[PDB]
Design a protein around this ligand. Sequence first.
Ligand SMILES: Nc1ncnc2c1ncn2[C@@H]1O[C@H](COP(=O)(O)OP(=O)(O)O)[C@@H](O)[C@H]1O
Ligand SMILES: Nc1ncnc2c1ncn2[C@@H]1O[C@H](COP(=O)(O)OP(=O)(O)O)[C@@H](O)[C@H]1O
Lengths: 540, 540
Amino acid sequence: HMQLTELSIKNQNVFVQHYIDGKEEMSSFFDYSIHHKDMWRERLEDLSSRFFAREELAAYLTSYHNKFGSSAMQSAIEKLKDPSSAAVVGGQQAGLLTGPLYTIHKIISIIVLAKQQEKELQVPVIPIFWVAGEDHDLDEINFVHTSEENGPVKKKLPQSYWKKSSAASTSLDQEKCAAWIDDVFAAFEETDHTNTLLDNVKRCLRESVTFTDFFELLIADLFQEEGLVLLNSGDPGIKKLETAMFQKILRENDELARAVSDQQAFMRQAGYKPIIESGKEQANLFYEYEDERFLIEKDNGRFVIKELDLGWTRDELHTHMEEHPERFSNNVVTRPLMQEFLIPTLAFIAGPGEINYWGELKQAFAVMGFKMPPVMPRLNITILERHIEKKLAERNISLQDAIERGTENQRETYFERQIPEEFTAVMDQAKSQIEAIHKTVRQEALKVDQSLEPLLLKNAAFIQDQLQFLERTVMKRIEEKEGYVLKDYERIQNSIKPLLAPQERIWNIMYYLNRYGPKFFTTFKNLPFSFQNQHQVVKL
Amino acid sequence: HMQLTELSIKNQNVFVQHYIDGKEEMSSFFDYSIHHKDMWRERLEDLSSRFFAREELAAYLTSYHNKFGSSAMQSAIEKLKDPSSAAVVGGQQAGLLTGPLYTIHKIISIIVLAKQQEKELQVPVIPIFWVAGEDHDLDEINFVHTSEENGPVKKKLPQSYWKKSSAASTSLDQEKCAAWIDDVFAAFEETDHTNTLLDNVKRCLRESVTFTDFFELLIADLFQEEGLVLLNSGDPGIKKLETAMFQKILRENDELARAVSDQQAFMRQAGYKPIIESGKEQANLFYEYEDERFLIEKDNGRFVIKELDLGWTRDELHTHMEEHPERFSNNVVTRPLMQEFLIPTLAFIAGPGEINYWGELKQAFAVMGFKMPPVMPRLNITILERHIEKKLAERNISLQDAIERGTENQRETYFERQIPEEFTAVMDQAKSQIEAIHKTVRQEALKVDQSLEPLLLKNAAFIQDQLQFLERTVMKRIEEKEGYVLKDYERIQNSIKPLLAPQERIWNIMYYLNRYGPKFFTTFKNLPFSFQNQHQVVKL
Ligand SMILES: Nc1ncnc2c1ncn2[C@@H]1O[C@H](COP(=O)(O)OP(=O)(O)O)[C@@H](O)[C@H]1O
Ligand SMILES: Nc1ncnc2c1ncn2[C@@H]1O[C@H](COP(=O)(O)OP(=O)(O)O)[C@@H](O)[C@H]1O
């Protein structure tokens, strides 16, 4: 049976660790403390004073979700009409094949938190996944890692984009994407699960047009049972509902840019590293023209797009937003403000990057007139396959050590212990003694002609090169002799900390579905995860 | 002034040395002793019982020599009609430009001996040079040595021969031979003598048709004053006079071949090395057909030419000799017998090869019914140029040592004395100590994997190669540093014992005429040489 364990592992980002630890200084960066049990009721009471267009949102969502044919999704959306309901929201880009595992872990986080709070608070709490379909960074979503001879390599979908178009409006080349899927799967070991899985994934592709369509369909197959609601930020249909918040962003635009710059300075001053790159020429909105996305920038009280020589006064842009809301979209700064406008948010589920940059946005929320919602760290998970757990034990490596720093230093220690002790010492001594002997010869030779010196020093270096080559040869032979053990260090790392990054950032769910099957995933989803800020280890 | 000195130098051929020393056993190999003063009168008395066709020979020679326009040659030939006269004879091949210096030394020997005996005996004694014009070995005569960067090199006349024709009947390509002469002279330093000499040599060429014509003309220019008589064995004109001796060779042919084979065995048995290659199938005559020369061989009492499918009975060949004597010619074995038939010979002047092979012919002479004439060693000469004598002194080499063995061993000793003593010892020690150190490393490496051994032994040998290359480099630098001295050892050898052979075998008179002029040659000819069997050194 599958087992859940925990480990206490520090985040390498000191801001995120301080947040997780509940430092007093975090009230300068966040509006709700996740460290007191009664915060959730307080959050609900704060939400009861806000106005949402719940019927309109629910009708849009209902209409959007008719493509999935899921009574569970529809029953979730129906709960949004109850004025006491709220949602747990988190989001990701629309990675091909669902992208990195942290996308799955995030969705699990949303669903688990929403269920736990529905039970504790006794109001409906809906799990919403925010598909970042407005985003035009297709290089972030157009590949998965595959495992090759030297380790993980990006396998990119072979399709180029002329237009800088959003994920939600970029079409997939059906034939190229099907071939790519075959190429990803061809790297796996074939199992009893392979054909059915590959058929299901290809079915989802042929029912898609865009990157977001395909992502949604896979996610619905995986989670519709749990009643997960999908909100695609790049769907033209949602834009009408966003009009007044685009207009609010416009009206408070100068105050917003000030709020970002001041918070970022404060963060830098407190000892931390802001990551949002958005100066005071930025309106923090994008405009779509001819299927492409352009930055809106500021020029002495006006709004401009420099690449298209377009501009607007504030009043002209306000009217333009009313008439054509579908042309507008948010950036990193404004997306969270739009989320909070649209959705009655009990909690936002955040990864470590998002925790850092949400701390940059505290004053931004205030400029828009509402609190930052509570920010709950998503679950951080490592899947420990049984053959990897066996190898950790065989190589005398502690699980926590592997998760924190991989296996490279351990491997290097093992290899060195295979070099006989007396080799190193005699090799060191030989280099030095041979050079001393050679020097005595050069001393005699030089009495013939001082102009020999360069040639004599070349000769000495050539001999030392031979000795180095000898040493390199003996090391290569040890590498060969010990190759089966040494490869096990590499296998452990490849699984747990590929490229010295966390498993959940590098790998993807398809490997695991292919190897372990649907019953694995069902069990995995339903494990008793908890939000105590501990690293979760799922032992297969 | 030019000075004559002597040195006592042993011949490397023990037979020739024993002859020169007057060993008792030499009466098995020769008919007259050159070691008793009264032999010359005895020889004259033996000749007074022989019949020669002196008027016929003198008329032929007179007619032949009209091309030279020399009253001195003609006055010499006139002496042959005196029934008391005799000749000193010696011979050589018709080398281009007069061939090796020993050709000049031989002619000097003939002229000096003839003059000395004319004075002592008070009968006319004529100097005759036997031009070996019948010989078809053009590769022996179609070049001279020239001095190039690595020492003496043969410079061959660029002309090929289809026909295996005699020197006396082979035409020179006028244009190719003039070019070749220019190329030989171009290697000399130009002097005040050059143009006149080159003009004289080219004049002789344009007055020649054949190899023998050119040789004779040069020799006449050099010696006609002394009344040297030229007998060209390959002139058709002389053949009629030879008829009866061709016929005698025929009649006694079986006895001749037996005489050669028995003497050769005896010589081998006495401890010496016969050099004539002529078995019992050999008639020891050649036949000329269509300008080419063919061996006459024997086949069960008949005479055959195998290559032309021609044969004769003895009686048929006898008649053929009478009708066509011009078609016949002698080989190494029969030439001396023909010489003795034709010319009343007081003495034969011989080089060291000829002394050896004349010893093979003692019984051959007897089969023909006459004694072998006295064999006088020709003068062996070294010309010592003043700059070479200076260099011998500077390099601490004794003249005799240089003449006996060149300068190579001395040069090698000088060079070694320039290698510091402590270099050799430290280089030797280093090779050994480095290999001992490297071995200790290989001993440690091999504990990893025994299959490394070849690679480890390769590594060790590569290092030892570096040390050898170091040593070779230091030696090359010493060679450069000492290059002016070392080159002087080489210069001395190049002059005195080029290619470790005697000067007189390798070099040629033109270099000396070009450098030193006609006055040099006049003086050289007239030096007081003596026949005491000592090496003659002519100091310029
Ligand atoms: N695509 C993948 N996603 C996640 N983990 C992987 C993937 N491929 C391999 N692994 C893990 O990494 C380990 C080492 O993989 P690898 O070196 O490719 O091959 P193997 O272990 O089969 O020789 C695997 O045993 C597995 O646990
Ligand atoms: N063609 C030659 N015949 C005879 N002796 C020669 C000839 N050429 C050179 N020599 C002799 O050999 C010596 C060495 O000659 P070589 O090395 O050619 O040139 P050099 O001495 O002029 O540098 C000369 O100095 C001379 O005494």
